[PDB]
Design a protein around this ligand. Structure first.
Ligand SMILES: CCCCCCCCCCCCCCCCCC(=O)OC[C@H](COP(=O)(O)OCCN)OC(=O)CCCCCCCCCCCCCCCCC
Ligand SMILES: CCCCCCCCCCCCCCCCCC(=O)OC[C@H](COP(=O)(O)OCCN)OC(=O)CCCCCCCCCCCCCCCCC
Ligand SMILES: CCCCCCCCCCCCCCCCCC(=O)OC[C@H](COP(=O)(O)OCCN)OC(=O)CCCCCCCCCCCCCCCCC
Ligand SMILES: CCCCCCCCCCCCCCCCCCCC
Ligand SMILES: CCCCCCCCCCCCCCCCCCCC
Ligand SMILES: CCCCCCCCCCCCCCCCCCCC
Lengths: 100, 101, 311, 476, 162
C-alpha cells in the first residue's frame, strides 16, 4: 500500500537536509548533528528497502547503521570536547592551520 | 480484523487521553490562582551507556528466538558476551567506570 | 453493529484502566504518606476526611490554585516540557500490562520493548528540568541524576531479557501464559532482583534519590513531577507482577483480584524499601549498577540460554 | 557452518583473540613492551596461519564472507602493513606521556577490518569492514590529540569519513532497493537484455563511489589527504596510506569483478575521468611541496589513480587482477619504506608543542642508510626501472594498452614526468647540505631496509612476485 | 498504515528543517529527537517493528541523550556565533542549499524509474530478525561487537580530562 519510491524519497530528503546542515554551520556541534541526520536517513532507506522485499536484511543493516552512528557520535563528541578544552571555542574555521 | 482494530483504537485513545490530561493539568495550573563547567565523567558515563545499549539490542534480538537458533547461536552469543565482559573489565580496571579516583 | 459496540467497549476498558492508574498514583502518594506513618510508629494524615481520604484532593487544589511561576531568565518550552515527560512516559508504559483475560489496552508484539522505549524517553525529564531552570546547582544535580539513571537503564533490558528468553516472545500475554506452572521469581531470581533495583532506580526512588533539579518548579508542575513518579511506581509494580509473578494466574480468586493483590503487595514493598533502606553514596550507586548488576544480567541470560537449550 | 569454514576464518579469529588478550593484559597492568609484543605476536601468528588457510582451500564462509587466494593475498598485505605500523609505533610511542597501549588495540581492530574487507563478498561485510578500518583510524589519527595538528587531522578525518560513510550507506540502500539482495553477484542479476544501466543502481553505485573514492583519496574527494597525512602521527600515516588504501581497493576490485553492473559503460567512463583527474592533480599538486607528508599524500592520490586505471581494464582484459596485485605489492613496500623513514626520523614523539618537521635536506651527512632507503623509495614511487614500482607501472601500462585506454596511458606518462620532477627533487635534496639507540628503533630501520631491498630485488628480478600473485585466484 | 507513514514523514522533514537552521543547541536537539520519534513511527508503519523500537530505544534514548549531555556540559550559548548568525544570511547558505537541491533532484530522478509493487506492511518481527541475525549474519554480529569496542576505546582515549 505504501510505495517504495516514497520511502526512498523521504530518506533522500533527510539525507540532503543533513548534508546542508553539515556544510553551512561553523559550529562543530551542528556539523555532528548533521552527520547524525545523514546516517539516520541512510538507515531509514535501508529499512524501506528491506521492508519492500519482505526481508530481515533491511532491519539487520539498520542495526549495523545505528551501531556505526552510536560509535561515530561518541567519537565526534569526544573530539568536540577536546576542541572546546584546548581552544575554548567550537569554530571549525579556526581549525585550519594545515594548508597548501 | 475486528479485535486488532478495536485494540488500535483503544491504544490511540489511551495516548491522546494521557497527553490531553497532562496538558489540561498544566493549563489549569496556569489558569487558576492569583499572582503577586562540568567534568568529562558525565560524558564518559553517557557514552558507555550508548555503547552497551547497542550491544544490549543485539542481545534483545538474540533472546527472542533461542529455540530457533540451536547451539550455534548460543556459541556466537557466548563470544559476543565474552567480548562484552572483556570490555567491561577493561573499563573497570582502568578507572573509566569509577566516579571517584 | 456488534463491531462498533466491541470497539467502544474496548475503548471504555482502556479509559477505565488509564483513570484507575492515575487515581492509583495520586491516591498512593497519599498512601505512601499513610504507610510511612505506619512504618514509623505513627499515623500519618488521618484527619482530612474519613481516614485522610480527602487529603489528596486538598493537595491537588492547593497546587492547582498556587501562583504559576517560571524563572525570568529561563527557557519556557523546556521548563514546561520536563514535567510532561516525567508524567507521560511511564503513564504510557503502563499500556502493555495484561490485567486480566480480556482487559488489556495494547496487546503489542513488542510490549517490553515499548516499556524500554518509555524509560529511554523518561530520562529527558530530569535533563530538561535541570537545564531549563538557569541554575548551576539544579543543572549539576540533574546531570548527576541522569548519569545514575543511565547506569541502571543499561541493564534493565537484560534483566528482563531473561524472562523474554524463557518465554520466547516479547509479548506480555505469552509471558504470563508461560507462568502457568512456575513463576519467573524462582528461575529468573537474578532477573527478578535486577529488575527490582533497575525499576527503583529509573524512578528516582529511595534509596536512589549541587541542589535538586526540582527547586525552581512549583505549583502544578511540581504536582506533575510527583504524580508522574507515583504513576511510574504503579507501572513498575504492575510490570513486575506481569513478568515474574504470573500476572492474573491464581487458583481460587478471580484473575483481576489476584493481579490487584500482587500489585498492591509490590507497591507496599516499594514504600517499605523507602522507609527502611539508607541512601548510599553516588559512586557506590554507579558501581553497583555497572560492576555488579550488568555482568549479573549478562551471566543470567547466558545461563538461562544454556539451561533452556539443555532441554 | 562447518569446521572447515572455521579453518577459513583463522586470520579473523586470531586478530580478534589478540584484541581481547591485549585488552585484558592492559586491564591487568599498563606495560608498553608487553602489550606491543603481544600485538605483534598476534599479527605474526595470523600472517603464519594464512598458510593453514591456504591449505584449507577456498570456500564461501557465509552468505557474507568468501575466502580464496585473492583474499589471502590481500590479508597478507594488510597484516604486513599492520606489523610495520606497530614496529614504527613503538619508538614513536616511547615519547608519548599519555597511555601508549590503546594504540595497539586500535591498530589490531583496524587490521581486523582490513581482513574483513579482504574477504568481503557482501554489501553488509563491505560496510562493516569500511567502518572497522575507519573508526580506529579516527582514534589513531588523533591519538596525540593535545597536539594541534593531530587534533585538526582527527577532526577533519572523522567528519569527512562520517560523511563518506553516510554516502556509502545511502548508495548501498538504493542498490538493495533495486536488487533485493546484498550479495555482490546479484547486483545486476535481476536486469538483463541490455537493461543493465538502471538509474537507481547507477546512482547507488555513484554514492558508493563517492564514499570509497574518499577512502581511496580519489579526485575530487582528495583534499583531506595532505592535511590528514601531515597531522596524523607518522606510524598512523603509514598505516592509513598502506593498509586502508590496499584493503579498500581490494574490496572495490572484488565488487567490480563479481557485480554484473561492473560491466556498465557509464561507471567505466566516470571511473576513467576520476583516474585521469587523480593522476594529473596528484602529480601537479606535489610539484612545490617542501613537506614530505603532504607530498606523499598527493603521491598517494596519483598512485591510486594508476590503480584505478588498472581497475577500469577489468572486464576487457584478463591480467588486470594480476596487475592490481603486483602494483599493490610494490606500492605497499614503497609507501611502507617512505613513511617508515619519516616515522623513525619523527621518533621519539617530542610532545604536543614541539614541531614535527621532517627536514629531509642533508639527511645523508648524518643518517646515510635511511637516506639511501628514502631515495630508493622515491625512485620506486616514480616508476623508474630497477624498482618494483616500475613493474607495477609496466603492468598498469600493459592493461591500459590491451584495453586501448589511450587517454589513461597518456595521463600515466605525463603524470609520471611530473612525478619525476618532484620525486627527484626530494631524492637529490637528501644529499644536499643542511645548516633511537635502543633495538626497537633498529628494528624499524631493519624494516625499512628490508622493504627497500625487496623493492630493488623485485625491480631487477620481478618473477617470484609475479608467480605468487598469479597463484592467487578468486572464485569466479 | 499509509496515513501514519505520511504524517510521520512530514513531521520528520519539518523537524529536520528546524534542526539545521536553529541557533539554540538544546532546541535543535529537541527537534532532532522529534524527528527520530517520527522516523520510528515510519518504521512502525512499514512493519519493521524492531526497527521502530530501536529508533526510540537506541537513537532517541541513547545517542541524543549523549548529545544533550555534551551540550549541557559545555553550556553552549552562541559564543560569538549566535551574535553573528552567519548561516542565516542568504549570501552564505545560497550555495550549499542549491547544491543539495541538485543532488536531491538527481537522486529523486533515479528513484522515480524503478519497479514498485508497493510495500505490503506485513510485520517482520524481532524474532525473525533474531533468527537471521544469528543465522546468516553471525560474522556481522561479532564484528559489530568489535566495532562498538573500537568506538568505546577511541571515545575514552579522546574524552578524558587529566
Ligand atoms: C509531547 C507529545 C510527544 C508525542 C506523543 C505522541 C504523538 C502521537 C499521538 C497519537 C498516537 C495515536 C496512536 C498511534 C497508533 C497506535 C497503534 C499502533 O501503533 O498500532 C500499530 C502496531 C500494531 O502492532 P501489533 O498490535 O503489535 O501487531 C498486530 C499488527 N496489526 O503497534 C505499534 O507499532 C506499537 C508501537 C508504537 C507505539 C507508539 C506510541 C507513542 C510513542 C511516543 C511517546 C512520546 C512520549 C513523549 C515525548 C518523550 C520525550 C521527547
Ligand atoms: C617535439 C614534440 C613532439 C615530441 C614530444 C616528446 C615529449 C617527451 C620529451 C620532451 C619533454 C619536454 C619536457 C620539458 C620540461 C622539462 C623539465 C624542466 O625544464 O624542468 C625545469 C624546471 C625547474 O627549473 P627552473 O626553471 O629553475 O624552476 C624553478 C622551480 N621553482 O621545472 C619546472 O619548472 C617544473 C617541471 C615540471 C615537470 C616537467 C614538465 C612535464 C610536462 C609533461 C611532459 C610530457 C610531454 C607532454 C608534451 C610536451 C610537448 C610536446
Ligand atoms: C492528526 C493530525 C496531525 C497533528 C499533529 C501531529 C500529531 C502526531 C502525528 C503522528 C503520529 C500519529 C500518526 C497517526 C496514527 C493513527 C493510527 C493509525 O493510523 O494506525 C494505523 C496503523 C495500525 O497498524 P496496522 O495493523 O498496520 O494497521 C493498518 C491497517 N490495518 O499504525 C501503524 O502501523 C503505526 C502507527 C504509528 C506509529 C506509532 C506512533 C508514532 C508517534 C510518532 C510521534 C512523532 C512526534 C510528534 C511530535 C508532535 C509535535 C511536532
Ligand atoms: C494498580 C492496578 C491497576 C489496575 C487498572 C485496571 C483495572 C481493571 C479492572 C477490571 C475488572 C474486571 C476484570 C475482568 C473480570 C474478572 C474479575 C471479576 C471480579 C472483579
Ligand atoms: C637505480 C636504483 C638505485 C641505485 C642506488 C641509488 C642510491 C642509493 C645510495 C647509495 C650511496 C649514495 C652515496 C652518495 C654520496 C654523495 C657524495 C657527494 C659528494 C659531493
Ligand atoms: C594531459 C594528459 C594528456 C594525455 C594525452 C593522451 C592522448 C590519447 C589519444 C587517444 C586517441 C584515440 C583515437 C581513437
Amino acid at each position: 500500500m505504501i510505495p517504495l519510491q516514497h520511502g526512498l524519497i523521504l530518506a533522500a530528503i533527510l539525507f540532503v537536509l543533513g548534508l546542508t546542515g553539515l556544510v553551512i554551520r561553523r559550529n562543530l556541534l551542528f556539523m555532528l548533528i548533521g552527520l547524525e541526520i545523514m546516517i539516520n536517513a541512510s538507515a531509514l532507506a535501508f529499512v524501506v528497502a528491506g521492508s519492500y522485499w519482505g526481508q530481515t536484511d533491511g532491519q539487520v543493516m539498520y542495526i549495523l547503521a545505528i551501531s556505526l552512528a552510536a560509535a561515530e557520535a561518541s567519537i565526534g563528541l569526544a573530539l568536540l570536547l577536546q576542541l572546546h578544552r584546548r581552544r575554548q571555542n567550537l569554530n571549525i574555521d579556526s581549525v585550519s592551520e594545515m594548508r597548501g | 480484523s475486528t479485535e486488532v482494530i478495536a485494540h488500535h483504537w483503544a491504544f490511540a485513545i489511551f495516548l491522546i487521553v494521557a497527553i490531553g490530561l497532562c496538558c489540561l493539568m498544566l493549563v489549569g495550573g496556569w489558569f487558576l490562582g492569583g499572582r503577586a563547567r562540568l567534568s568529562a565523567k558525565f560524558y564518559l558515563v553517557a557514552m558507555f551507556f550508548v555503547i552497551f545499549d547497542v550491544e544490549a539490542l543485539y542481545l534483545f534480538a538474540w533472546s527472542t528466538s533461542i529455540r530457533e537458533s540451536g547451539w550455534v547461536g548460543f556459541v556466537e552469543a557466548a563470544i559476543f558476551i565474552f567480548v562484552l565482559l572483556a570490555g567491561l573489565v577493561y573499563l573497570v580496571r582502568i578507572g573509566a567506570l569509577d566516579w571517584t579516583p | 453493529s456488534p463491531e462498533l459496540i466491541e470497539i467502544l467497549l474496548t475503548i471504555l476498558k482502556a479509559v477505565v484502566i488509564l483513570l484507575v492508574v492515575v487515581t492509583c498514583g495520586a491516591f498512593m502518594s497519599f498512601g505512601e504518606r499513610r504507610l510511612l506513618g505506619l512504618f514509623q510508629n505513627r499515623y500519618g494524615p488521618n484527619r482530612v476526611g474519613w481516614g485522610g481520604s480527602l487529603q489528596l484532593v486538598a493537595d491537588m487544589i492547593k497546587m492547582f490554585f498556587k501562583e504559576d511561576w517560571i524563572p525570568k531568565f529561563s527557557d519556557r518550552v523546556i521548563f514546561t516540557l520536563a514535567p510532561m515527560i516525567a508524567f507521560t512516559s511511564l503513564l504510557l508504559a503502563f499500556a502493555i500490562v495484561p490485567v486480566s483475560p480480556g482487559w488489556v489496552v495494547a496487546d503489542l508484539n513488542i510490549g517490553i520493548l515499548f516499556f524500554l522505549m518509555m524509560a529511554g524517553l523518561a530520562v529527558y525529564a530530569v535533563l530538561f528540568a535541570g537545564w531549563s531552570s538557569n541554575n548551576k546547582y539544579s543543572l549539576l544535580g540533574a546531570m548527576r541524576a541522569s548519569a545514575q539513571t543511565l547506569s541502571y537503564e543499561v541493564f534493565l533490558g537484560l534483566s528482563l531479557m531473561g524472562v523474554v528468553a524463557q518465554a520466547g516472545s516479547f509479548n506480555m500475554t505469552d509471558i504470563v501464559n508461560s507462568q502457568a506452572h512456575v513463576w519467573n521469581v524462582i528461575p529468573q531470581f537474578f532477573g527478578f532482583i535486577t529488575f527490582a533495583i533497575a525499576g527503583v532506580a529509573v524512578c528516582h526512588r529511595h534509596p536512589f534519590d549541587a541542589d535538586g533539579y526540582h527547586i525552581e518548579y512549583s505549583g502544578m508542575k511540581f504536582g506533575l513531577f510527583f504524580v508522574g513518579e507515583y504513576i511510574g511506581i504503579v507501572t513498575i509494580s504492575a510490570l513486575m507482577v506481569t513478568l515474574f509473578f504470573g500476572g492474573w494466574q491464581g487458583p481460587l480468586l478471580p484473575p483481576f483480584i489476584w493481579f490487584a493483590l500482587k500489585t498492591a503487595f509490590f507497591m507496599m514493598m516499594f514504600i517499605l524499601i523507602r522507609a527502611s533502606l539508607p541512601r548510599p553514596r553516588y559512586d557506590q550507586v554507579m558501581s553497583f549498577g555497572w560492576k555488579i548488576c550488568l555482568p549479573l544480567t549478562l551471566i543470567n541470560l547466558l545461563v538461562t540460554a544454556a539451561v533452556i537449550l539443555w532441554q | 557452518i562447518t569446521p572447515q569454514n572455521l579453518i577459513a576464518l583463522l586470520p579473523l579469529l586470531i586478530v580478534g583473540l589478540t584484541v581481547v588478550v591485549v585488552m585484558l593484559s592492559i586491564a591487568w597492568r599498563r606495560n608498553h613492551f608487553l602489550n606491543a609484543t603481544l600485538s605483534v605476536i598476534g599479527l605474526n601468528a595470523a600472517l603464519v596461519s594464512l598458510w593453514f588457510v591456504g591449505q584449507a582451500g577456498a570456500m564461501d564462509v557465509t552468505p557474507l564472507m568468501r575466502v580464496d587466494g585473492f583474499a589471502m593475498l590481500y590479508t597478507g598485505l594488510v597484516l604486513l602493513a599492520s606489523l610495520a605500523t606497530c614496529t614504527f609505533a613503538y619508538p614513536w610511542l616511547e615519547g608519548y606521556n599519555d597511555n601508549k597501549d590503546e594504540f595497539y588495540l586500535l591498530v589490531l581492530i583496524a587490521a581486523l577490518g582490513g581482513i574483513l574487507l579482504a574477504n568481503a563478498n557482501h554489501l553488509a561485510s563491505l560496510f562493516l569492514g569500511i567502518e572497522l578500518i575507519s573508526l580506529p583510524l579516527f582514534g589513531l589519527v588523533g591519538y596525540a590529540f593535545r597536539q594541534k595538528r593531530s587534533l585538526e587531522a582527527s577532526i577533519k578525518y572523522t567528519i569527512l569519513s562520517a560523511a563518506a560513510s553516510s554516502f556509502l550507506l545511502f548508495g548501498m540502500a538504493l542498490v538493495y532497493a533495486q536488487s533485493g539482495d546484498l550479495s555482490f553477484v546479484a547486483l545486476g542479476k535481476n536486469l538483463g537484455d541490455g537493461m543493465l544501466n538502471e538509474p537507481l543502481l547507477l546512482a547507488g553505485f555513484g554514492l558508493m563511489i563517492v564514499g570509497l573514492g574518499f577512502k581511496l583519496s580519489l579526485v575530487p574527494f582528495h583534499l583531506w589527504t595532505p592535511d590528514v597525512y601531515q597531522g596524523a602521527p607518522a606510524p598512523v600515516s603509514t598505516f592509513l596510506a598502506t593498509a586502508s588504501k590496499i584493503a579498500i581497493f581490494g574490496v572495490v576490485m572484488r565488487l567490480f569483478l563479481y557485480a554484473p553492473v561492473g560491466d556498465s559503460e557509464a561507471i567505466r567512463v566516470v571511473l576513467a575521468i576520476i583516474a585521469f583527474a587523480s593522476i594529473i592533480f596528484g602529480n601537479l599538486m606535489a610539484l612545490s611541496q617542501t613537506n614530505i607528508k603532504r607530498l606523499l599524500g598527493y603521491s598517494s592520490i596519483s598512485h591510486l589513480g594508476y590503480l584505478l586505471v588498472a581497475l577500469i581494464a577489468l572486464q576487457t582484459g584478463e591480467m588486470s587482477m594480476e596487475a592490481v596485485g603486483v602494483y599493490l605489492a610494490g606500492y605497499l613496500f614503497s609507501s611502507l619504506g617512505a613513511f617508515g623513514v619519516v616515522s623513525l626520523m619523527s621518533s621519539p614523539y617530542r610532545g604536543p608543542d614541539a614541531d614535527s618537521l621532517f627536514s629531509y635536506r642533508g639527511l645523508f651527512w648524518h643518517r646515510p642508510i635511511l637516506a639511501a632507503v628514502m631515495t630508493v623509495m622515491m625512485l620506486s614511487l616514480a616508476g623508474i626501472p630497477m624498482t618494483l614500482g616500475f613493474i607495477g607501472k609496466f603492468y598498469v601500462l600493459a592493461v591500459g594498452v590491451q584495453a586501448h585506454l589511450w587517454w589513461l596511458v597518456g595521463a600515466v606518462v605525463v603524470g609520471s614526468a611530473i612525478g619525476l620532477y618532484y620525486y627527484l627533487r626530494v631524492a637529490v635534496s637528501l644529499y644536499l647540505h643542511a645548516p633511537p639507540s635502543n633495538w626497537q628503533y633498529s628494528a624499524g630501520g631493519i624494516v625499512v631496509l628490508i622493504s627497500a631491498l625487496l623493492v630493488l630485488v623485485l625491480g631487477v628480478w620481478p618473477q617470484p612476485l609475479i608467480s605468487i600473485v598469479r597463484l592467487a585466484m578468486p572464485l569466479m | 498504515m499509509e496515513f501514519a507513514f505520511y504524517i510521520c514523514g512530514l513531521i520528520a522533514i519539518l523537524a529536520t528543517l528546524r534542526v539545521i537552521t536553529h541557533t539554540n543547541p538544546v532546541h535543535a536537539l529537541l527537534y532532532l529527537i522529534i524527528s527520530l520519534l517520527a522516523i520510528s513511527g515510519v518504521f512502525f508503519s512499514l512493519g519493521a517493528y524492531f526497527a521502530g523500537a530501536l529508533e526510540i530505544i537506541v537513537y532517541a534514548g541513547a545517542i541524543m541523550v549523549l548529545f544533550v549531555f555534551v551540550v549541557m556540559m559545555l553550556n553552549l550559548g552562541g559564543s560569538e556565533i549566535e551574535q553573528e548568525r552567519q548561516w542565516l544570511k542568504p549570501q552564505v547558505w545560497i550555495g550549499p542549499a542549491i547544491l543539495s537541491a541538485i543532488m536531491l533532484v538527481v537522486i529523486v530522478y533515479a528513484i522515480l524509474g524503478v519497479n514498485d509493487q508497493g510495500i505490503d506492511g506485513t510485520p517482520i518481527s524481532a524474532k525473525a530478525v533474531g533468527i537471521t541475525l544469528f543465522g546468516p549474519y553471525v560474522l556481522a554480529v561479532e564484528l559489530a561487537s568489535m566495532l562498538l569496542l573500537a568506538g568505546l576505546v577511541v571515545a575514552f582515549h579522546v574524552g578524558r580530562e587529566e
